[PDB]
């Protein structure tokens, strides 16, 4: 049983300090140990620090690059883990896993879902979003492809649903990528046959530096 | 450092096959604190198997673990399309923890053309500024694929942005997308724009295109 939710992600001209934070649920499980996992493309995952409680206050132990860095702390009283991390680079950005462990004889241990940390040099920048109806004629079979391109937004954290969520059958995001610290990526639905009163198909998005576009078909 | 390595790198399955994805040690640990996560894309560590041989709340029971000493080993019976992740072993023996390369798996299908597509710029875009020709290319199997946008004959790839898709779920089928991306002075400058495919299943290409339906 269990409930971790982490706060705190973004984004920091490098050297930026931060504050990741996780709260246990579920738990006042007398004896865990906690710590945080992180991974980018670069180095898939790696354990980057642990506090630890069998009973003991504090016991840290962190890693080749991490050490000097960042200090893990939490405190039981609080319900909370916080991670602050200095000087950091580029080397440095992922998503932190806050994944703690129970010291039962056996079990497993949890783990929650993470955040993005983005160390660039760079500044944010809203998405332009635009639709993507047809052309003159979709043809292949009897079906049709909508579409929505999202040129030019900057940190990567990025959600794009179609029609408040509510049709999912045949959607496809596409992983966004980079030209010019500035990423673009676009979806497709391909809804049925009959090219429909277009009028209800929305395609919403979300982009946490501040934005939430909408749309609509020719 | 401590090194765990995994053998293979990426796997190809038929649905209903045995897969069995190794780990193995540097140094001489334990059986028990060789922990296995399984990530499926677009998703977080999804803690699989704990000791070297008990299962975590859910995993199916199809699924197999065993080893002692430096290899350690994980089995599927049946290979079935949801197990289609990328697997990782993990040490908790000494510091550093740390983990497998991670396999791969994939689930096996028939080959299938696919559904390309190709709207035109977007009304808003173009009186904004620069405007792109983007190019959907849907459902399609296997992933070994190429694609050009040739417009009036010399293939002009200059801003051609390849973005792929992990399999499907329900269908189990790579989708990608690619965008040409031009200075408007050098939009109206054309006509035949044409995206073509090319991929192991039709030796004669796809090539849906747009003369001009706006203007």
């Known amino acids: 049983e269990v409930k971790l939710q982490e706060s705190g992600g973004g984004l920091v001209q490098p050297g930026g300090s931060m504050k990741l934070s996780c709260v246990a649920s579920?738990?006042?499980?007398?004896?865990?140990?906690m710590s945080w996992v992180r991974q980018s493309p670069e180095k898939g995952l790696e354990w980057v620090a642990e506090?630890?409680?069998?009973?003991?206050?504090?016991?840290?132990h962190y890693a080749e690059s991490v050490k000097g860095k960042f200090i893990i702390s939490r405190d039981d009283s609080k319900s909370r883990l916080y991670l602050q991390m200095n000087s950091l680079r580029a080397e440095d950005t992922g998503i932190y896993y806050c994944?703690?462990?129970?010291?039962?004889?056996?079990?497993?241990?949890?783990w929650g879902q993470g955040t993005s940390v983005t160390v660039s040099s760079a500044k944010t920048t809203p998405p332009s979003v635009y639709p993507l109806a047809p052309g003159s004629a979709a043809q292949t079979n009897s079906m049709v492809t909508l579409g929505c391109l999202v040129k030019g937004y900057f940190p990567e954290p990025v959600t794009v649903t179609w029609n408040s969520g509510s049709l999912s059958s045949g959607v496809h995001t596409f992983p966004a990528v980079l030209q010019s610290d500035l990423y673009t990526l676009s979806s497709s639905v391909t809804v049925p046959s009959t090219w429909r009163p277009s009028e209800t198909v929305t395609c919403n998005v979300a982009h946490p530096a501040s934005s939430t576009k909408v749309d609509k078909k020719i | 450092d401590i090194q765990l390595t995994q053998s293979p790198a990426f796997m190809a399955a038929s649905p209903g096959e045995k897969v069995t994805i190794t780990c193995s040690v540097s140094?001489?640990?334990?059986?028990?604190?060789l922990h296995w996560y399984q990530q499926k894309s677009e998703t977080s560590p999804k803690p699989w198997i704990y000791?070297?041989?008990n299962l975590a709340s859910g995993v199916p029971v199809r699924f197999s673990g065993s080893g002692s000493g430096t290899s350690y080993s994980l089995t599927i019976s049946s290979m079935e399309a949801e197990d289609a992740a990328t697997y990782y072993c993990?040490?908790?023996?000494?510091?550093?923890?740390?983990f497998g390369g991670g396999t791969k798996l994939e689930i096996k299908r028939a080959d299938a053309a696919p559904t390309v597509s190709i709207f035109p710029p977007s009304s808003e875009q173009l009186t904004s500024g620069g405007a792109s020709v983007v190019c959907f290319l849907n459902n399609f199997y296997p992933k070994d694929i190429n694609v050009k946008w040739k417009i009036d004959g010399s293939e002009r790839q200059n801003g051609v942005l390849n973005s792929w898709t992990d399999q499907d779920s329900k269908d189990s089928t790579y989708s990608m997308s690619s965008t040409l991306t031009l200075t408007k002075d050098e939009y109206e400058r054309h006509n035949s724009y044409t995206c073509e495919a090319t991929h192991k299943t039709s030796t004669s290409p796809i090539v849906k295109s747009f003369n001009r339906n706006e203007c």
């Open positions: 994944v703690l462990r129970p010291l039962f004889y056996y079990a497993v241990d949890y």
């Open positions: 579920g738990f006042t499980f007398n004896n865990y140990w």
């Open positions: 506090i630890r409680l069998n009973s003991d206050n504090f016991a840290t």
């Open positions: 140094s001489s640990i334990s059986s028990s604190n």
């Open positions: 000791g070297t041989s």
């Open positions: 993990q040490q908790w023996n000494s510091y550093p923890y740390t």
